Amino acid sequence: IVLTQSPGTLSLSPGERATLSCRASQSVVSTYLAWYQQKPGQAPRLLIYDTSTRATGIPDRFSGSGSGTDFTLTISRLEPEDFAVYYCQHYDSSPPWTFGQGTKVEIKRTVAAPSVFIFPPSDEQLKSGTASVVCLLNNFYPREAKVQWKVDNALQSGNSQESVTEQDSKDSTYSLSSTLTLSKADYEKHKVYACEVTHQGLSSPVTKSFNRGE
Amino acid sequence: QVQLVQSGAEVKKPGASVKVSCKASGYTFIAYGISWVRQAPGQGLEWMGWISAHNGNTNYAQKFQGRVTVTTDTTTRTAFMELRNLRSDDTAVYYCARAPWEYNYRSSGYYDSPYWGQGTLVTVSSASTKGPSVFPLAPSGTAALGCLVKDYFPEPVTVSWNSGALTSGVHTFPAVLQSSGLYSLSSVVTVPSSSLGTQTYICNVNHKPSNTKVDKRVEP
Amino acid sequence: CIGITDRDFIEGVHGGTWVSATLEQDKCVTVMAPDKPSLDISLQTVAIDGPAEARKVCYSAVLTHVKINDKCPSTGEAHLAEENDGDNACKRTYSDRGWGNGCGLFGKGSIVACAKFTCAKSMSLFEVDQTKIQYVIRAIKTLKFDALSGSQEAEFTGYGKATLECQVQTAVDFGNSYIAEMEKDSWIVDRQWAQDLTLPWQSGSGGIWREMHHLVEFEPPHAATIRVLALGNQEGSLKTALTGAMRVTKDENDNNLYKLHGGHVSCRVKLSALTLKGTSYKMCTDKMSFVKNPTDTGHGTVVMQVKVPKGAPCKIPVIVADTAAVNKGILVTVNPIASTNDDEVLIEVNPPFGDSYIIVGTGDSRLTYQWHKEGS
């Protein structure tokens, strides 16, 4: 019994109408589909049990539906609170709970390119024995962006970890900071470091480069 | 009201065992078997196992068959979960949820609202507590500067800028786990070029588990 | 068609001539006068237009959304908000409790269960407005009629203006019977039989599914749980209980909710002062065979069809004796004459109780039949 939740990432401005789809395997008289809302940093708040009956204290705008294998969670008027990830669970005549694969509803705005910044490892840190290069992306939209580390024109993959902050509460923007962790002996053995940035709002992929301590 | 009370925070090294409690309260616990769901950080939800109280037969997910064992305590009004040898990806938040007792399309509560308990933050990794190593990110159009809170365990850490005087353009990033088992994040601020050599910027790092408080100043 | 006899009409001094004849469905009656064309009166249908729905009996229930409240022995009685809802049916038994299932002391512990009632398939019961029964005479000119409008006028070329004072006599006395409609099939059932049914019924104004417990029974309660015995569709018990009932064909041509059925009609035609003609028929004593053997109609009458190859223009002597010739076999068929040779003529007979003997023929070539009747 497989589930199919679409769409994945939803970009709607406040006041518009939302419509999610948790496409189930088979919709029969015994089919339970609990919807959910998950804010980053909190437990899911139960939204609708069964398929369309609102939970305790859930506002009036939340309502479910069922037609064929596809179910639908509908939000009439979106509000700033209602921007989070939504889930769906399924169990029918069997113990297992099959959950949805996520649906994040984010605020939409005009595509804004990031301002790329690169930070060399602090000369104090290299005395310890590790070097971490930080490549910072600031105040961009949409979230989808790729950062590739270029160490002496060589694509390095296998030592970099990224972290994207949640959407801003003022202008609805994201940020990203890639960290390249290298040992001291391997760090100074190279010369030029950079991070290639590819984004939707860039006419040409920007790269901020810096040589070894110059 | 009607609620489920779970256990507190637990930290175990890989291969050990974890027993999470879930004390049902407010309803007839004899029916309404209690199911278990978890959440890896970033990853979505997936159901691990399920138990009943009346007709105590249980069921487990095929991936977690050989590890988990769920028990119940009728007199104490509690539902348990024992997790066997712990891997690295087993770090998650574990929830207990009210559920029907037979799952036969009409017994008792097959169409009732499933309540959820609190969180059970299980953090499994080899290492022990460590204080944070704070390193600066000095600047070189709009200027950007920040601090690198590196090699700290465990979460959380509060990076306050200028002892609370900066709230514009301060993007404190979520932490990541390195290959050594110690987190490290960055907290940067976008400042105008005129405020570089005139004002004074200090990043105030406060780590509660180690009670280590670091206030580093960023000089260009 | 079918010719009339002498005493079927009367021509007076002044005014006109009247014909009093009974017309059943698909049986014509002609009016012939010398130096004038023959007539052909055909009764097309005797039907009803959009009967009124009295109630709606459910015979296939779907029970879901089962919720329980459990009270320990001697701690009060369990209550649920679904006992007052019109969607759910509830039951109140007791479950044995003790120190094991967590209750204070021993004894029969109270428990209440409720299950949502969702009727999927339901048969409906229609009641006829006897005055609004339609019956059509296609004398070609088309004439419709009601029990209220027994007289409708139409002028024909050759006979002047004609007024037809008609009257309809029913066949089942809708004053005590219903019209049950299943998924596709239909029936005519008794009103009290349909009201003495052990099935839930929805009221006329819409109401609710009153008396749901005829279809909802729960398993005996365990410690704090119920299983619902989903009593399936009792259609297997209904279509079997509806075996010995009269059917009603829905419709073929007119429209929907236009239910056709057979019956009886009596008419009187007001024609001008004309010298009409009479035609007599002899008796059928020749060889004859059954096309459709005498079968039941449901309301006591037996219907038989016969074929007369020799000496067609005659009426068939149908005798139902106690064998001897003395008959107590009250005859329903009017004008049992043969239209043409190698044709079939319908014969409706109302035998008495017990065991009778149908007699078709005289002397040689008698078509006999026995028909046990234990109507109650």
The residues spanned by each domain of chain B are: 3-124, 133-217
β partners of residue C29: C41
Write out the residue range of the structural domain in which residue A24 sits.
4-106
Chain A residues within an 8 Å CB radius of C65: 50
Q: Please check whether residue C37 touches B, CB under 8 A.
A: no
Q: How many CB atoms lie within 10 A of CB B108?
A: 27
The residues, ordered by sequence, that sit 6+ positions from C267 with a Cβ below 8 Å of its Cβ are C20, C21, C22, C23, C137, C164, C165, C166, C167
Closest residue of C to A31, CA-based? C64
DSSP-based helix, strand, coil % in chain B, nearest 5: 0, 45, 55
Phi, psi of A32 (to 5 degrees): -110, 130
Six token digits for residue A116: 């790329």
User: Do the Cβ atoms of C64 and C116 come closer than 8 Å?
Assistant: yes
Regarding whether A150 and A89 lie in a shared domain, the answer is: no
* Boundary (domain end) residue, out of A79, A106, A133: A106
CA dist A64 and A47 (Å) reads 9
Q: How many CB atoms lie within 10 A of CB B43?
A: 11
User: Do the Cβ atoms of A91 and B98 come closer than 8 Å?
Assistant: no
Regarding whether A206 and A119 lie in a shared domain, the answer is: yes
- C-alpha closest to that of C259 among C325, C192, C172: C172
Regarding whether A182 and A121 lie in a shared domain, the answer is: yes
User: Do the Cβ atoms of B154 and B127 come closer than 8 Å?
Assistant: no
Q: Is A134 exposed, middle or buried (0-12, 13-18, 19+ CB in 10 A)?
A: buried
Strand B121-123 vs strand B10-11: parallel, antiparallel, or unpaired?
Answer: parallel
The CATH number assigned to the domain holding A152 equals: 2.60.40.10
The total domain count for chain A is 2
- Rounded to 5°, the CA angle A70-A43-B176 comes to 105
β partners of residue C10: C18
Residue in the structure block whose two tokens are 């002597």: C317
- C-alpha closest to that of A31 among A18, A44, A39, A22: A22
Chain A residues within an 8 Å CB radius of C88: none
Regarding whether A85 and A126 lie in a shared domain, the answer is: no
Chains within contact range of chain C (3+ C-beta pairs < 8 Å) = A, B
Q: What is the identity of the amino acid at C181?
A: E
From residue B141, how far is each of A177, B144, B191 by CA, in Å?
A: 19, 9, 10
Question: Following DSSP, what letter does each residue of C30-78 receive, concatenated?
Answer: ----TTSPPP-BEEEEEEEESPEEEEEEEEEEEEEEEEEEE--TTS---
CA dist B195 and B217 (Å) reads 14
User: Do the Cβ atoms of B4 and B114 come closer than 8 Å?
Assistant: no
Q: Please check whether residue A134 touches B, CB under 8 A.
A: yes
Q: Please check whether residue C195 touches B, CB under 8 A.
A: no
Six token digits for residue C194: 């349909």
Residue in the structure block whose two tokens are 């009932």: C245
β partners of residue C179: C126
Torsion, CA C221, CA C227, CA C228, CA C230, rounded to 10? -140
Regarding whether A9 and A97 lie in a shared domain, the answer is: yes
The structure's method of determination equals X-ray
* CA Rg value for chain B: 23
In the 8-state DSSP scheme, what is residue B125? -
Chain B residues within an 8 Å CB radius of C101: 30, 54, 74
Q: If DSSP codes are grouped into helix, strand and coil, which group holds residue C131?
A: helix
Regarding whether A119 and A194 lie in a shared domain, the answer is: yes
β partners of residue A70: A23, A67
CA dist C22 and B151 (Å) reads 109
CA dist B80 and C373 (Å) reads 73
Question: Following DSSP, what letter does each residue of B92-114 receive, concatenated?
Answer: EEEEEEE--SS-SSSSSSTTSPP
Strand C52-70 vs strand C107-127: parallel, antiparallel, or unpaired?
Answer: antiparallel
Q: Please check whether residue A29 touches C, CB under 8 A.
A: yes
CA dist B29 and B98 (Å) reads 9
Regarding whether A8 and A100 lie in a shared domain, the answer is: yes
CA dist A155 and A149 (Å) reads 6
Count H helices and E strands in chain C, helices first.
Answer: 2, 25
Phi, psi of C339 (to 5 degrees): -70, -60
Q: If DSSP codes are grouped into helix, strand and coil, which group holds residue C133?
A: coil
Q: If DSSP codes are grouped into helix, strand and coil, which group holds residue B217?
A: strand
User: Do the Cβ atoms of B94 and B120 come closer than 8 Å?
Assistant: yes
* Boundary (domain end) residue, out of A57, A82, A106: A106
CA dist B196 and B44 (Å) reads 43
Torsion, CA C356, CA C359, CA C363, CA C367, rounded to 10? -120
- C-alpha closest to that of C199 among C165, C237, C171: C237
Interface test with C, best of B32, B108, B110, B113 (most C CBs within 10 A): B108
DSSP-based helix, strand, coil % in chain C, nearest 5: 5, 45, 50
CA dist C373 and C376 (Å) reads 9
Q: How many CB atoms lie within 10 A of CB C110?
A: 22
Question: Is domain B3-124 given the CATH code 2.40.50.100 in the classification?
Answer: no
In the 8-state DSSP scheme, what is residue C21? E
Phi, psi of A43 (to 5 degrees): -70, 150
* Boundary (domain end) residue, out of A106, A139, A168: A106
Give the closest-approach CA distance of B73 to chain C in angstroms: 11
Cα-to-chain-centroid distance, residue B203:
25
Resolution in angstrom units = 3.8
From residue C105, how far is each of C98, C100, C102 by CA, in Å?
A: 6, 10, 9
User: Do the Cβ atoms of B46 and A96 come closer than 8 Å?
Assistant: no
Interface test with A, best of B45, B68, B96 (most A CBs within 10 A): B45
Architecture of domain B133-217: Sandwich (2.60)
Sheet containing strand C344-349, edge to edge, reads: C289-296, C302-307, C344-349
- Rounded to 5°, the CA angle C363-C369-C372 comes to 140
Regarding whether A129 and A203 lie in a shared domain, the answer is: yes
Torsion, CA A112, CA A113, CA A118, CA A119, rounded to 10? 0
CA dist A144 and C215 (Å) reads 58
Interface test with B, best of C63, C65, C66, C71 (most B CBs within 10 A): C66
CA dist A84 and A36 (Å) reads 10
Give the closest-approach CA distance of C239 to chain B in angstroms: 28
Give the closest-approach CA distance of B60 to chain A in angstroms: 8
Strand C264-272 vs strand C258-260: parallel, antiparallel, or unpaired?
Answer: unpaired
- Rounded to 5°, the CA angle A119-A123-A126 comes to 105
Q: Do B107 and C115 touch (CB under 8 A)?
A: no
CA dist A88 and B98 (Å) reads 16
Residue in the structure block whose two tokens are 């009764």: C43
β partners of residue B182: none
Q: Please check whether residue A28 touches C, CB under 8 A.
A: no
Regarding whether A139 and A102 lie in a shared domain, the answer is: no
Sheet containing strand A160-161, edge to edge, reads: A115-119, A130-140, A174-183, A160-161
- C-alpha closest to that of C39 among C84, C8, C82: C8
Q: Do B44 and A165 touch (CB under 8 A)?
A: no
Question: Following DSSP, what letter does each residue of chain A receive, concatenated?
Answer: ---EEE-SEEE--TTS-EEEEEE-S---SS-EEEEEEE-TTSPPEEEEETTTEE-TT--TTEEEEEETTEEEEEESS--GGG-SEEEEEEESSSSPPEEP---EEE-----B--EEEEEPPPTTGGGTTEEEEEEEEEEEBSS--EEEEEESS-EE-SSEE--BPPPPSSS--EEEEEEEEEEHHHHHT--EEEEEEE-TT-SS-EEEEEETT-
In the 8-state DSSP scheme, what is residue C340? S
CA dist B109 and B99 (Å) reads 7
Regarding whether A203 and A122 lie in a shared domain, the answer is: yes
- C-alpha closest to that of B169 among B185, B200, B190: B190
Question: Following DSSP, what letter does each residue of C269-315 receive, concatenated?
Answer: EEEES--------EE--S--EEEEEEEE-SSS-EEEEEE--SS-SEE
The residues, ordered by sequence, that sit 6+ positions from B194 with a Cβ below 8 Å of its Cβ are none
Six token digits for residue A142: 């949409």
Q: If DSSP codes are grouped into helix, strand and coil, which group holds residue C346?
A: strand
Residue from the list A44, A97, A161 with its beta carbon closest to the beta carbon of B35: A97
Six token digits for residue A23: 């496409």
Six token digits for residue C363: 């002397």
Regarding whether A61 and A30 lie in a shared domain, the answer is: yes
